[PDB]
């Protein structure tokens, strides 16, 4: 029974883990029976979700994407917990290249092909005037030859604030926590030597926690903690910030998120005048000698270099270049603004960019909830609902089949991106 079942959520201070703990409580699990184990207190300072903001938008790449997006949208708009953090300013993808404009048009046509009426809130913008109408901060000269795809249901999400909001509730309810070494997963605990039955976890300080079920929602670290058999390859993306005065920020108030696949994106200034800028590239790995559990020997694994643990890192010189190109493309009036709070943010890619959400094939009672593939902050409100369905043997096949255990299913180093990721050992300047 739910009220009598003990769950441990490893990575419970991050995106998928906090969502899961939330939905355990909403399903009627007893709060004191839920233990969140995260290296950092929620919201985890090293979580990919520990960010001023993130984009919410529709992206149909795999079978469950449409239902997941609609689910999330409903809750970002209507869930009392999450709705303060969704800013429905819309999103506009732009391009001025022949191939880029082709991609926009095809993406639009894919929305239409869903047959549910997405054309009502998503529009191709074929003229300069139409683009300026949605994004008045542009100049007419700047956008010569641009085409746009405007997604009206999109916007941005106050990410760290939303995870904090879950955390405050978990703590009010009396969820148990472990942080630091007493919150850092070392290995699963098993009833027998055959490791067919997981009964808990041990953390790096030696603390043992017993439970009926364990959820590994450790994001970019999951692949380092247990042997995922190269199903997940962890990668770093980059961002920088720029500071605008209130008068500079005024032109951007409630302006849509702007994205171009050849450059990256920026989000409107937050309440303190801060604009976050990202480039667009296939990410950086960080291979280092490492030892995951369930692996007989140390493998080469891409392991996050955590900014929270080493705030003196930034990002490579090549990233400074591409983030400045993005600023020149979108925000040329701010070309002289100083970049700051430069950082790397870690995700873990599967081969096909589907989640990896399933019971471990051998370790019964141990569940994976990872493979975020760099596009899952938007699922904060709803993904925990399906993790709980999975725990309970009620997960529908559209999700179950997409999220299944699948070693050897393709190359996660390239994933659905333009190229295999380069490694930080080959990129100077971040250290
Ligand atoms: C990097 C990034 C990602 C991103 C984005 C921009 C950047 C730069 N923009 C996005 C956007 O606009 N829209 C969107 O939907 N997603 C976007 N993303 C992706 C998003 O950040 C990630 O997909 C998502 O947040 C990942 O969720 P997940 O839960 O998988 O990962 P996490 O939040 O990092 O949580 C992992 C937690 O695990 C803890 N941890 C790590 N090691 C341990 C051990 N050993 N024991 C216990 N806990 C552990 C971490 O502390 C973390 O809290
Ligand atoms: O999933 C989305 O709607 C946008 S994710 C934004 C982003 O920075 O997330 C991290 C990486 O996946 C990047 O490729 C990507 O541009």
Go through the domains of the chain in sequence order and give each one's CATH number. Answer: 1-87+154-232+351-410 (3.50.50.60), 88-153+233-350+411-431 (3.30.9.10)
Nearest-ligand number for the alpha carbon of 54: 1
3-state helix, strand, coil in the chain (%, to 5): 30, 25, 45
Nearest-ligand number for the alpha carbon of 163: 1
d(CA 389, CA 387): 5
Of all protein residues, whose CA lies closest to atom 20 belonging to ligand 1? 377
Of all protein residues, whose CA lies closest to atom 1 belonging to ligand 2? 375
Packing angle between helix 383-392 and helix 15-27, nearest 10 degrees?
60
Residue 200 alpha carbon to ligand 1 centre in Å: 23
Strands 274-279 and 233-243, how do they pair? Answer: antiparallel
Question: Which atom of ligand 2 has the smallest separation from the CA of 259?
Answer: 16
DSSP secondary structure code for residue 248 in this structure? H
Of all protein residues, whose CA lies closest to atom 27 belonging to ligand 1? 15
Give backbone dihedrals phi and psi of 299, rounded to 5 degrees, phi first.
-105, 170
* Residues framing ligand 1 (Cβ under 6 A): 10-11, 13-17, 37-40, 44, 46-49, 54-55, 183-185, 217-221, 225, 237, 239, 278, 345, 347, 370, 372, 374-378
**213: β partners:** 7
SS3 call for 74: helix
d(CA 154, CA 88): 6
302: left (phi over 0), alpha (psi -120 to 50) or beta: beta
Q: Are 122 and 149 in contact (CB under 8 A)?
A: yes
Q: Are 117 and 123 in contact (CB under 8 A)?
A: no
Residue 42 alpha carbon to ligand 1 centre in Å: 12
Question: Residues near 362 by Cβ (< 8 Å), separated by ≥ 6?
Answer: 195, 196, 294
**243: β partners:** 274
Q: Are 344 and 430 in contact (CB under 8 A)?
A: yes
Q: Are 399 and 388 in contact (CB under 8 A)?
A: no
Mutation probe of ligand 2 site: the residue of 258, 281, 346, 374 with most atoms within 8 A of C-beta? 374
Residue 198 alpha carbon to ligand 2 centre in Å: 34
d(CA 391, CA 212): 10
Strands 122-125 and 198-203, how do they pair? Answer: unpaired
**Consecutive H or E run containing 408:** none
| Secondary structure E strands in 145-303 | 147-151, 155-157, 176-178, 185-190, 198-203, 208-210, 213-216, 233-243, 257-260, 264-266, 274-279, 284-285, 287-290, 299-302
What tokens were used for 90? 């819309």
Letter string b/e over residues 138-163, b meaning 16 or more CB atoms within 10 A of that residue's CB:
beeebbeebbbbbbbbbbbbbbbebb
CA angle 263, 351, 59 (to 5 degrees): 50
Question: Which atom of ligand 2 has the smallest separation from the CA of 281?
Answer: 14
Q: Are 52 and 160 in contact (CB under 8 A)?
A: yes
Give backbone dihedrals phi and psi of 266, rounded to 5 degrees, phi first.
-135, 155
Mutation probe of ligand 1 site: the residue of 374, 381, 382, 386 with most atoms within 8 A of C-beta? 374
- End-to-end Cα separation, the chain, in angstroms: 50
Question: Residues near 370 by Cβ (< 8 Å), separated by ≥ 6?
Answer: 11, 16, 216, 217, 218, 219, 222, 223, 228, 232, 348, 355, 356, 357
Q: Are 381 and 82 in contact (CB under 8 A)?
A: yes
d(CA 319, CA 339): 12
Sign (positive or negative) of CA dihedral 415, 420, 424, 428: negative
300: left (phi over 0), alpha (psi -120 to 50) or beta: beta
Nearest-ligand number for the alpha carbon of 91: 2
Mutation probe of ligand 1 site: the residue of 18, 48, 188 with most atoms within 8 A of C-beta? 48
Q: Other CB atoms closer than 10 Å to residue 120's CB: what's the count?
A: 9
Packing angle between helix 159-173 and helix 15-27, nearest 10 degrees?
40
d(CA 136, CA 356): 41
Q: Are 393 and 402 in contact (CB under 8 A)?
A: no
Q: Other CB atoms closer than 10 Å to residue 262's CB: what's the count?
A: 16
């Amino acid at each position: 029974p739910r009220a009598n079942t003990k769950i441990i959520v490893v990575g419970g201070g991050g995106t998928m883990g906090s969502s899961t703990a939330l939905h355990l409580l909403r399903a009627g699990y007893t709060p004191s029976n839920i233990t969140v184990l995260d290296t950092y207190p929620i919201p985890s300072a090293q979580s990919a979700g520990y960010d001023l903001n993130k984009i919410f938008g529709i992206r149909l790449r795999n079978k469950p994407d449409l239902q997941l997006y609609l689910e999330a949208l409903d809750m970002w708009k209507n869930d009392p917990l999450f709705k303060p953090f969704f800013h429905n300013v819309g999103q506009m993808d732009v391009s001025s290249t022949e191939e880029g404009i082709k991609k926009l048009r095809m993406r639009y046509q894919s929305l239409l092909d869903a047959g549910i009426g997405l054309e009502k809130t998503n529009f191709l913008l074929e003229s300069e005037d139409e683009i300026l109408a949605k994004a008045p901060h542009f100049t007419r000269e700047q956008i010569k030859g641009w085409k746009g795809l405007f997604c009206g249901d999109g916007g941005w999400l106050a990410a760290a604030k939303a995870i904090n909001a879950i955390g405050q509730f978990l703590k009010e309810q009396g969820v148990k926590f472990g942080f630091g070494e007493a919150g850092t997963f070392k290995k699963p605990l098993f009833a027998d030597a055959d490791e067919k039955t997981c009964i808990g976890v041990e953390t790096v300080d030696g603390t043992k926690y017993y439970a009926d079920k364990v959820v590994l929602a450790a994001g970019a670290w999951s692949s380092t903690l247990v042997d995922l058999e190269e199903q997940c390859v962890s990668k770093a993306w980059v961002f920088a910030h720029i500071q605008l005065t209130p008068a500079e920020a005024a032109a951007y108030k409630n302006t849509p998120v702007i994205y171009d696949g050849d450059y990256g994106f920026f989000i409107e200034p937050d309440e303190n005048g801060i604009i976050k800028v990202c480039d667009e590239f296939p990410g950086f790995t960080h291979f280092k000698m490492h030892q995951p559990y369930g692996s007989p020997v140390p493998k080469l694994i891409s392991v996050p270099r955590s900014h929270a643990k080493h705030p003196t890192d930034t990002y490579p010189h090549a990233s400074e270049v591409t983030i400045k190109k993005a600023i020149n493309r979108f925000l040329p009036r701010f070309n002289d603004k100083e970049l700051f709070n430069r950082a790397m943010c870690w995700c873990t890619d599967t081969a096909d960019a589907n989640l990896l959400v399933c019971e471990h094939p051998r370790w019964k009672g141990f569940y994976l909830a990872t493979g975020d593939s760099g596009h899952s902050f938007k699922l904060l409100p709803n993904i925990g609902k399906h993790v709980v369905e999975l725990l309970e043997g009620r997960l529908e096949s559209v999700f179950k089949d997409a999220w299944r255990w699948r070693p050897g299913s393709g190359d996660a180093l390239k994933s659905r991106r333009a190229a295999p990721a380069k490694d930080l050992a080959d990129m100077p300047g971040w250290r």
